[PDB]
Design a protein around this ligand. Sequence first.
Ligand SMILES: Cc1cc2nc3c(=O)[nH]c(=O)nc-3n(C[C@H](O)[C@H](O)[C@H](O)COP(=O)(O)OP(=O)(O)OC[C@H]3O[C@@H](n4cnc5c(N)ncnc54)[C@H](O)[C@@H]3O)c2cc1C
Ligand SMILES: Cc1cc2nc3c(=O)[nH]c(=O)nc-3n(C[C@H](O)[C@H](O)[C@H](O)COP(=O)(O)OP(=O)(O)OC[C@H]3O[C@@H](n4cnc5c(N)ncnc54)[C@H](O)[C@@H]3O)c2cc1C
Ligand SMILES: Nc1ncnc2c1ncn2[C@@H]1O[C@H](COP(=O)(O)OP(=O)(O)O)[C@@H](O)[C@H]1OP(=O)(O)O
Lengths: 575, 578
Amino acid sequence: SLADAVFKSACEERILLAYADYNPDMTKVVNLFSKYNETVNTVRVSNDAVKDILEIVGWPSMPLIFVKGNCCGGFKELYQLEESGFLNEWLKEHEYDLAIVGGGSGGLAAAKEAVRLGKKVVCLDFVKPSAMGTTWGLGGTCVNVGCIPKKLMHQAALLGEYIEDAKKFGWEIPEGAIKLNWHQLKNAVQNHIASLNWGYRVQLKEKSVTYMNSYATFTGSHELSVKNKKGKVEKVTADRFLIAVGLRPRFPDVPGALECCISSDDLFSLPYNPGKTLCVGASYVSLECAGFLKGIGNDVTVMVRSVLLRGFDQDMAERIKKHMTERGVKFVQCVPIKYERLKKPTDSEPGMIRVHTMQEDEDGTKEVTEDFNTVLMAIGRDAMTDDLGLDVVGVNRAKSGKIIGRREQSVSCPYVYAIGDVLYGSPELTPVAIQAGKVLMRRLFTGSSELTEYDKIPTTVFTPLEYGSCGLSEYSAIQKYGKENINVYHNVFIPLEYAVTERKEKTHCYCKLICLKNEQDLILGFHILTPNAGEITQGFAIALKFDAKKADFDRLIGIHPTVAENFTTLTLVKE
Amino acid sequence: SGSLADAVFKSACEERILLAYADYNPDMTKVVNLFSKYNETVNTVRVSNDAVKDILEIVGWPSMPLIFVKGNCCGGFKELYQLEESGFLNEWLKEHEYDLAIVGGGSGGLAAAKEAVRLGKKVVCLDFVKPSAMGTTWGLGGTCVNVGCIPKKLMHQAALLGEYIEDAKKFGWEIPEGAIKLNWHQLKNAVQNHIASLNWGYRVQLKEKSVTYMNSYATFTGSHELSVKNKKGKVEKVTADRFLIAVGLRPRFPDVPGALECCISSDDLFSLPYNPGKTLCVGASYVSLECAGFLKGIGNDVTVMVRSVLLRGFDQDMAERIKKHMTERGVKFVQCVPIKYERLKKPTDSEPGMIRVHTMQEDEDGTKEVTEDFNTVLMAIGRDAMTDDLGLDVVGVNRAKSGKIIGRREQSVSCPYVYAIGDVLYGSPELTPVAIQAGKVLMRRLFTGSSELTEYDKIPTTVFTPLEYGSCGLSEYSAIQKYGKENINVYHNVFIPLEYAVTERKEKTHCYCKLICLKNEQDLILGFHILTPNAGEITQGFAIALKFDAKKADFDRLIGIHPTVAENFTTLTLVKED
Ligand SMILES: Cc1cc2nc3c(=O)[nH]c(=O)nc-3n(C[C@H](O)[C@H](O)[C@H](O)COP(=O)(O)OP(=O)(O)OC[C@H]3O[C@@H](n4cnc5c(N)ncnc54)[C@H](O)[C@@H]3O)c2cc1C
Ligand SMILES: Cc1cc2nc3c(=O)[nH]c(=O)nc-3n(C[C@H](O)[C@H](O)[C@H](O)COP(=O)(O)OP(=O)(O)OC[C@H]3O[C@@H](n4cnc5c(N)ncnc54)[C@H](O)[C@@H]3O)c2cc1C
Ligand SMILES: Nc1ncnc2c1ncn2[C@@H]1O[C@H](COP(=O)(O)OP(=O)(O)O)[C@@H](O)[C@H]1OP(=O)(O)O
């Protein structure tokens, strides 16, 4: 048989053995499953198809064993499961076909797709409060404390710059400095978040998915114990588990950090204008937040350890820095050594943090202080998986708390899967979680060979001036292929919308196309610094799925007038 | 066998007079002896049989034996003997002042001029702007720069910034309360100051790049001679080995009494010394709706009179959606055509006039004449080629029924050393980026001997209506007409741009996208359509999908950028069933 026949057979059949040619331990398998009154269906895989099948399930020798549509590997893996007693518990009936731990981007996407394929699904979501005590509804990081509130506050900051544009285009706006009222913005954002929480809660109920607002821990091979807000503990059993627990803001081992500094978990529901703010960190979260806080008129400082946007093209990173500097954000090469609280916040006004730094001159080191209203700790995001009981169900984790996959299947446990941010090496983006969820569900319950494509994923950093990208940085391309084999085509431009204004952005917009010279200027990556970078980058990202060349960009006809057409017309080679 | 295409075209670019023949060759000693008459060497090439059909397709001729003159494809012997017998060949083979004369200083003309001169050729560019009926005139850059896309997009942005002022309030910006008016004079000066900078830019760019600019209207007075007249009425003579016609079009006026006296055009709208006030837009083209749209957005009372359908050529589903939205935004649409325009007041000193517009309306008894008073009437019923006074008869360049030049690609079908690009080229889509690409590419064929062709299919557009409409490829109707309803899948969704989520905008109920797919070829994408803020920025990249025969599966395995409107193309599942 071919692949799809094998995977379909595997999805449908309760226990399937996939073989190339007659091997001794197939009898041993028959005899072992005979022990449990189980019937072992078999398939002669054709030799034309072995390699493909082996690559898809991510195992390296041929004889393959499936249990309830989950790939276990070979005999050693099976005998391990049997010897551990797991197989005996696995073969029993359970309450749910699938239990999902996490009600975020991935969780909810998986839940919706599973139930559309007619499976009994439970979804567990619980939000342990931040250190400041902040908590929120269903939907996960993106909905409550991630992309959706951040984009709204970015739009607030842009509408600031639009008010001034409106004057240059002839709109007679009554004279007077205009201030943004934090309470109005925050209520407007929180009201939308509240509508999405209800939306998801409804969507789950409407689709016959069981929701439990309860924090889940493995207390058995196929048993989660789940604790709700009241402290009530229930037991949930299932034939399969999806871990989509995501991450939480990282705090450093520094005195006062956890006492004095807020995180993105807290910023989007603050009962006060955060005032003179310090953003600690160089991640996209620090710069996005610093950006909009400046745009709504706060005094903003960013303290970075060494470089901005580690992982991103450093040319583009330096360009974001020059621009946000021109827009009045202060950058400083420090890491605080202590945070001291001077004033607690009220329900209407912010507090005061004293921030301690070591500063050098040519004569020695000074301990130096500086008083900020609010300090945003934004250095990263970690997996909080210590209290999940992954030891109980023998799910290996990386040094960080992230789960180690064979694709999305736990590398060590065949009926536990992970997607989204907690999957070791998964890019931490909402649309990736969703696609991983939707696609996994289609492999598990449909027996398709469809794989989430984790390469050449487009991003946008929503800095005051937006940065869109897909593919290699100029550095990575040069490191992997030589300098001699890379062409960079690039250009500056002025968005027409800015032409009649005196905006600082007129001197900062830039795009570059990274091309492999010795393979017909094949496009390895592209990068653009512009209004609406995300709207522009999305479509152009499909070019990389087809091994597009520069010639393909040059024979594409522009829409005039747009920023996007600039990618149609590049001729200048960087050095 | 013998030579392949690029060797032939390279040989043709380099050699003064080339004869390209197949394994098989006809009389073509007569031709040799003909060019021997002119002290010429006739270089020859055995084209390989592997290459004949390609080469024939590229130059757009049907028989094998091919003759080239000064890097121009003439056809076969009949065409050559015709040129000889007409005396043209004798004049062609002489030296001329310029390698190339370009008639038109617009999108195509200037693009061609820059590309020719980069390939080290002596080029003259001629541009003159005959005033509108109201007397309006403008500088270098053509329609786009002065009276087309550049001023239009700025006035659109003015209209959007209107809706942004209100958004700013819902996001918490404390804007002092009280109606906000847009001051027409400020907007118009801001636009005209930008146009002035582009005018200057282009004029300088030409001087810096060693291109001769003459602000003179050009007419063919010889096989290889333009006579050109400047503003002062001074007439000069310009000769060249080749000519590029990039004359563009001008607004159409109807044979209706008072139309030309009373109604402005886009030629006049962008420099009006007055707020146009209560406006009538006559026409259903993108020009009428774009202008009606921004005039509404800056707070004018706007009416659109359409003969029959909006945006003929465009997807009528999307057209009806634009109508419903612009209706919700206060634009009045009427199925009427004026039968007379009567001027009541002239525009004087920073104020508009009053036009009385006459219509036939039926009531419960029959048809009556009805009048209605508008401040300004924008005649926007299309654009025509004004090629009657160009002397194309003199150089025997065939024109279509409209004034447009008939091409064998961009070569005049009838004269081998005259070429046309942009709006005046019969069947060329009328867009700035097409003109530019046609110009740049032609120049690379003519002076480099490359086989590169401008790609005139699957061209993305955006209509900059109050809510922007972006598209590429077939409409739902065209796809159904060509393939059949049983073989078409239409995937579609509504969505709310996050930027609108906390507002009470009308647009929240109107944003829509659809993907038109050929069911029996793995949902191959024939077209896509989106109604959204920033439709142009979204459509551009997605348009490259159609250069690779993208399937729906390609859109589904593309990972979205969240949150953007664009990602909606990544997660379409709903099938339209009417
Ligand atoms: C400030 C910020 C801005 C961002 N901006 C963007 C952006 O613009 N675009 C973009 O694509 N991505 C963005 N991201 C990333 C995006 O939010 C994540 O990639 C995405 O939310 C990951 O979703 P997930 O399903 O993996 O996890 P989450 O959304 O974190 O879902 C996990 C859920 O599981 C719950 N949970 C944890 N443990 C348990 C347990 N034991 N039992 C039950 N429930 C549990 C958690 O409380 C949480 O609700 C941003 C992230 C942040 C923090
Ligand atoms: C209101 C409006 C909005 C538009 N919006 C868009 C849009 O958003 N996007 C887009 O892609 N396209 C748009 N277009 C179309 C675009 O302007 C044209 O497609 C483009 O300008 C055509 O370029 P061209 O070189 O063919 O002609 P033109 O730009 O018209 O250039 C012709 C020039 O030659 C001059 N000329 C004419 N005859 C002679 C002669 N005998 N001797 C010398 N000079 C002569 C003309 O006066 C003119 O200066 C718009 C058009 C209009 C009218
Ligand atoms: N004399 C006239 N009076 C009123 N409307 C007219 C007109 N001539 C053209 N139009 C309209 O003005 C627009 C532009 O004319 P066009 O000839 O450039 O359009 P098309 O793209 O159909 O070739 C069309 O909406 C057209 O309506 P019809 O499609 O019914 O012709």
